[PDB]
Structure 1
């Protein structure tokens, strides 16, 4: 009663975005996801902290999922802001966890450990190749796509067949992560220490050092690299459409579609936009408001995704580098969409 209430309060504080979308789910399905999120967040808080030894994480992280049964466990000196409160009072999270369905628990605990190890794998190294990039996204976001899908099936709102092949589920998360990584470029590289996610296998093709983009001097090259990043992101769209088209429950659907449409809308604004290198490109509050309202049923979301992918490809020129490549991806995305119309 009290415990679960803390989760939403801490959730509402930690992630103001997700906290909203999650309200689309029904109480039960909602409580599980809330916990599921927090657990992943608490785990994230331990990694993002750069005031704790590297061999310390490689020690506790892989063992983190075991605390989900230790209602007395908690951490105190890690995290920034509300995140700290989440770990120091992690008790509430584990308290609510114990009361969830055994099935839900196994999924949360399962993904937690799987994601944890992935972080350790990328702690002692960086993202150099595309394969590195795609894998990293799988660990931090992709796995959330699996965890969620599995949670949808365990609830019964979706058919079990939905968990047969989690390739699309992975794409879902990878689309949100890659879109954000692109959008939040400047925001990340300005932090201390500078955060980088863009794969060297891609940005090397346009510069020697990534910090070079923060210069209006190397603007031209900067934009090219950007479009290349977006191009890589659009590869997931067709699969995103497929996944959404396989959902049958209203609650589950809306909750899964909104974040996607959101991403597609953001991806259409950052595309070939030099502003991405000096500010945080965002959509109007009225834009998201429209999305949150019309993304309750497939057909509707499809026309919005359609329009945003059109506005994206409509922001380039024939004699522009990434032209030929982008158009192929646009047609692909639209084909997958019209394929469900």
Structure 2
């Protein structure tokens, strides 16, 4: 039992806000989602640990799920901060895992493995094309959508038809990952070594070297690339909407909707905004407090999404290059919203 409490404490420490979002769910769903989070979290620590050998990761990850049974396993010497602990004391995790609906355990193990291997793939090669981009996001966040959607069905709160086609569930994942990948460009490019996520295929058209955007001598082509990333992210909106509109349970909806609304808001703030290149553009807490408050039912979350996407549209002028394209994707989004209002 003190295992469950450990998982929730490490979570509160590892992901501040998500530790609030997860509280929307009922303990049963809550327990699985928390386990699921930590499992993927540990897995993410290994992949990101720059201080250790690659061949080591390739020989580990592929069987990281296997450990979900060995209540004595753990990794002391990996990652930093809380993560390191999560691994060294990874026993409580599996100890909690052990006592979850059989079905839940299968989604976790399943998704974990799939993501692990997926991570390996991109651990060798690099992301240069948009196809690389989307596929990486699939392994990194899309699969979380698959897993969470499979958990929703399993639990019984949502209709099994929801898990039939996971295309939109994938879109939910990607939309969150891309919005975050865009917002954290600077924070990540400053890392040691520098972490880059923007696809070569997109920025190549705006510069010869990514690190160039740090110097505003290149703002022009910096923002212009930013707008192109924001545009590539908007593609998903229409699908996030459908997915949300298909949800029926009040718990699963709020849990699924809040993060999406948070991303749209963030996206409408980093769009056509050079501050992204020298700092972390963030939403105000009032704004997130309001988002967390009204994102409990379809109609209300639709008006918020609309409001944010419209504000993003206001960010530009006819002058701006990306205009015709953004206007397009935006109207494709509002249309999607209107058909559910």
Give the TM-score band, short-chain normalised: over 0.9
CA-CA distance at 1:301 after TM superposition? 0.2
CA-CA distance at 1:195 after TM superposition? 0.6
Question: Structure 1, residues 268-325: CA drift from partner, whole Å, max 9, x if none?
Answer: 0000000100000000000000000000000000000000000000010012100000
Distance 2:82 2:231 in 1: 36
Distance 1:133 1:328 in 2: 22
Name the structure 2 match of 1:15.
15
Name the structure 1 match of 2:73.
73
Distance 1:269 1:60 in 2: 39
CA-CA distance at 1:203 after TM superposition? 0.1
Distance 2:126 2:37 in 1: 25
CA-CA distance at 1:200 after TM superposition? 0.4
Cα RMSD for the two superposed structures: 0.4
Distance 1:313 1:324 in 2: 11
Question: Structure 1, residues 22-54: CA drift from partner, whole Å, max 9, x if none?
Answer: 000001000000000000000001111011111
Normalising by structure 2, report the TM-score: 1.00
SS at match of 2:252: helix
CA-CA distance at 1:69 after TM superposition? 0.5
Name the structure 1 match of 2:36.
36
Give runs of ≥4 in structure 1 deviating > 4 Å: none
CA-CA distance at 1:107 after TM superposition? 0.2
2:278 aligned with 1:278: yes
Gaps of 5+ in 2: none
CA-CA distance at 1:17 after TM superposition? 1.7
Name the structure 2 match of 1:24.
24
Question: Structure 1, residues 210-232: CA drift from partner, whole Å, max 9, x if none?
Answer: 01100010000000000000000
Question: Structure 1, residues 87-142: CA drift from partner, whole Å, max 9, x if none?
Answer: 00000000000100110000000000000001100000111000000000000100
Aligned residues: 341
CA-CA distance at 1:18 after TM superposition? 1.1
Distance 1:50 1:190 in 2: 14
Distance 2:336 2:42 in 1: 37
Name the structure 1 match of 2:330.
330
Distance 2:274 2:99 in 1: 49
Distance 1:149 1:178 in 2: 20
SS at match of 2:125: coil
Gaps of 5+ in 1: none
Distance 2:84 2:180 in 1: 24
Distance 2:139 2:19 in 1: 21
